[PDB]
Amino acid sequence: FETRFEKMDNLLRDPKSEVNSDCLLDGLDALVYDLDFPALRKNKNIDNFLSRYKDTINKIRDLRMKAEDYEVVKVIGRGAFGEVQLVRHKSTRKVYAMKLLSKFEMIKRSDSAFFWEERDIMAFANSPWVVQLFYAFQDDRYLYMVMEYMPGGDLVNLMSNYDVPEKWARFYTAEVVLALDAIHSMGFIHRDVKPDNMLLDKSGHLKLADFGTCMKMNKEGMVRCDTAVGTPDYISPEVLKSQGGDGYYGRECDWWSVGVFLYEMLVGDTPFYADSLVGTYSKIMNHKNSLTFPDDNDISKEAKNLICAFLTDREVRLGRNGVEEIKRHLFFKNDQWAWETLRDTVAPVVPDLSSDIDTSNFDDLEEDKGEEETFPIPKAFVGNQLPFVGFTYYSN
Amino acid sequence: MSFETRFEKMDNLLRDPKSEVNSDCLLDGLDALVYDLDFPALRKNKNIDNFLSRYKDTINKIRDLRMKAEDYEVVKVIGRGAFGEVQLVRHKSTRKVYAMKLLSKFEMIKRSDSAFFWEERDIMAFANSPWVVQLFYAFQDDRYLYMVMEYMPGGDLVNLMSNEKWARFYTAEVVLALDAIHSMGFIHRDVKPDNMLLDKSGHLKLADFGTCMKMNKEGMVRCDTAVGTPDYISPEVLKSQYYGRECDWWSVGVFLYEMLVGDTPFYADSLVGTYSKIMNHKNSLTFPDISKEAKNLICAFLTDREVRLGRNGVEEIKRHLFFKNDQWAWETLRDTVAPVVPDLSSDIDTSNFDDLEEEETFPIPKAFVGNQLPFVGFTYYSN
Numbered sequence A: 001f002e003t004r005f006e007k008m009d010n011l012l013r014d015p016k017s018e019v020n021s022d023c024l025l026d027g028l029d030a031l032v033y034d035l036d037f038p039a040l041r042k043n044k045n046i047d048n049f050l051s052r053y054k055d056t057i058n059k060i061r062d063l064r065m066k067a068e069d070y071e072v073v074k075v076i077g078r079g080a081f082g083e084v085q086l087v088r089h090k091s092t093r094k095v096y097a098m099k100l101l102s103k104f105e106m107i108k109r110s111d112s113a114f115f116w117e118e119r120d121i122m123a124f125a126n127s128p129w130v131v132q133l134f135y136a137f138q139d140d141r142y143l144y145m146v147m148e149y150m151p152g153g154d155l156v157n158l159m160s161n162y163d164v165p166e167k168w169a170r171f172y173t174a175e176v177v178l179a180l181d182a183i184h185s186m187g188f189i190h191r192d193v194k195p196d197n198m199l200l201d202k203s204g205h206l207k208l209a210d211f212g213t214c215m216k217m218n219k220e221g222m223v224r225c226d227t228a229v230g231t232p233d234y235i236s237p238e239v240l241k242s243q244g245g246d247g248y249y250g251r252e253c254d255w256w257s258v259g260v261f262l263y264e265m266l267v268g269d270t271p272f273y274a275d276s277l278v279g280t281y282s283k284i285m286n287h288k289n290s291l292t293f294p295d296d297n298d299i300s301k302e303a304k305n306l307i308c309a310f311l312t313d314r315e316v317r318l319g320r321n322g323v324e325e326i327k328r329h330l331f332f333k334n335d336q337w338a339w340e341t342l343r344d345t346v347a348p349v350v351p352d353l354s355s356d357i358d359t360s361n362f363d364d365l366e367e368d369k370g371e372e373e374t375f376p377i378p379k380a381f382v383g384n385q386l387p388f389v390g391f392t393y394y395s396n
Numbered sequence B: 001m002s003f004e005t006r007f008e009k010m011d012n013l014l015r016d017p018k019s020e021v022n023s024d025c026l027l028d029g030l031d032a033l034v035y036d037l038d039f040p041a042l043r044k045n046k047n048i049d050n051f052l053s054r055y056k057d058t059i060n061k062i063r064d065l066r067m068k069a070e071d072y073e074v075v076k077v078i079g080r081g082a083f084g085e086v087q088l089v090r091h092k093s094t095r096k097v098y099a100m101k102l103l104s105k106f107e108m109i110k111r112s113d114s115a116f117f118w119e120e121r122d123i124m125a126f127a128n129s130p131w132v133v134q135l136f137y138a139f140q141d142d143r144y145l146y147m148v149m150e151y152m153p154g155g156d157l158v159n160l161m162s163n164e165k166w167a168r169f170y171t172a173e174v175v176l177a178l179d180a181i182h183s184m185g186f187i188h189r190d191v192k193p194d195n196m197l198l199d200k201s202g203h204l205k206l207a208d209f210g211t212c213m214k215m216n217k218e219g220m221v222r223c224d225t226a227v228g229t230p231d232y233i234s235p236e237v238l239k240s241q242y243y244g245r246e247c248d249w250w251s252v253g254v255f256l257y258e259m260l261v262g263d264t265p266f267y268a269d270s271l272v273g274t275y276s277k278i279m280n281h282k283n284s285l286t287f288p289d290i291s292k293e294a295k296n297l298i299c300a301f302l303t304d305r306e307v308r309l310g311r312n313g314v315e316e317i318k319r320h321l322f323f324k325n326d327q328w329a330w331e332t333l334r335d336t337v338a339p340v341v342p343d344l345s346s347d348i349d350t351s352n353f354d355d356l357e358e359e360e361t362f363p364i365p366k367a368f369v370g371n372q373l374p375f376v377g378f379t380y381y382s383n
């Protein structure tokens, strides 16, 4: 008998659970949204409903972590679907990074399921290689993800403010080789590696920060996707031959992007850069060929033997099997850090921060709020809030 | 009004069963959506499908932990009403024995009103009185609402009248049970022997409340539709086409009368007449002779509203000579022993209840209707 009443409470507390405390609220909350347009109030049932809750709900909405609870500093970042912000928690004066996503856009645009994989990970990954999620929540307009601010900055920027020396390269490349094995180990392929997505903390050490692609591999390391993902200059061959329906790839693809990282980093441009993106397509599939190099050998035998081992055909890429083989590769041989400690050592660059909110590594932005799209008032039920039902996550 | 602040204010709402948003309420809404959406006709909506994707199965498991009606062993239909029926049953798990009335979510919508059960639930469950039947559990599914209440082997007080030191006892208890209600801020609006039940110890409680209405701070109510049973309804409730608790006493007189007499003090071959009967309470009031105290009570309740025993202060009804006695006292009446005691064979003796023998089911929708929305929050696990 008591095989249930016990099994129940788990579900109502387990942050991993789809129906935990804050989840069930999101559903009730959402109803209250997707029904309170008078056009529907014309339904006895619907009316009788809003009557009973409306007010309660409103109060519940005052207690739950609302966007107001945050003080907006400056637009640290912005993307297709939303933007990232630096904020101080107006109560506990804590300072986080808060990414907003557009419930609107994400409906208009074909896909609105990518953020699940992200939240789950950033929040539970628990690893200094992954940025950390502290809170998540929604209104009728946005999803908000509150995260460990990274005073450090993107690595695309560090390559716009330096001329990375091979030693620095080895170090950055190794952290990324590590950061990824983390995600790999959680049964996820990243699927959009690139500087854009590698940030630094107060101590000039790297984590990854967008998971806007992340997909979980099956029991045998693979995935059955069938639409390309990432960024032109990085994506791998497999994920272009992706084109429904033969897409069938594993870990390996995330290493290819690594090659492109390592490349752009020492060189200065992507290994498949093209004045016409459409060209970068051909380039990538000709990796065997297209792979040129600076006629000025300003680089290592070890760096090359690495890169052209990553930027090789999937069937045969460093790491096709075992991360080990990438690690014990010549290029990483050195004596200033060791795999099992790299992060404890001292990053090639350290944050020259003036304060807790030194947004100097981040190129200032205009800061338009609410400007974009607005959901239409419907003539009947559509349930626009239903696929964001469960997003909310408080913890610690 | 502060992070640490509201976050306190929140927990309450999730824990206090009087709250509309308690744990068990939340679920009902999440559960209800899953019902009113799962119809193929709608799953043709991107969002609506993607949604049932994410929950449907989860919820299905949650429906197996929650107190499902399966959890109970059906005994026999001890009761039956227009909107459903009452049943005796043993909790298949902990073999306990309760009285589980069912309501028809279907009929309750087809029938113009579906709000009356809230008063009931609230009362039966929070009353905390020997005077009110108690509610242990409440819950629902796509078809019925269920109320698990303390069984009453005793029986209805109209059945007792088919088998005055006796009447002064019953009438007293009813006078007391009812003051409980009023003090809760409720005016029952449907007294009758049908709604009066007796416990293992021949003591009475009230059982139906699908009528009760909360009086405003002025002890008054602003209704304008008649409810109850014909032979009982009071005059002011018929002219309803604003008042207060006094009308619940009128019924009290109607009980005392039929109790002593044999039939209602406004009976009619054609109920229709009973209407004008009650309106002419002054006249119509006939008489077969028993007590001078009985009479002085009766024709003090069956008086015009503006002047009825208990206009204000129900103590005056108490201090009316009819109650003068020496075998019980107000502040003990229940402790005494009842004029009748349950001669039960066991825990499930449905002897005092006459054994009793459509079946409409909701229409599949061609769009969102939300027929389960008005019963969202019913569910009530109590302790």
Ligand SMILES: O=C1N=CCc2cc(NC(=O)[C@@H]3CNC[C@H]3c3ccc(Cl)cc3)c(Cl)cc21
Binding pocket: A076, A077, A078, A079, A080, A081, A082, A083, A084, A097, A099, A100, A131, A147, A148, A149, A150, A151, A154, A196, A197, A198, A199, A209, A210
């Ligand atoms: O401190 C941060 N802490 C966590 C995550 C984070 C993420 C980002 N943003 C990005 O990593 C991407 C990469 N290039 C565009 C930028 C971006 C901005 C908004 C969206 Cl919606 C998507 C992507 C920034 Cl800047 C800072 C932080």
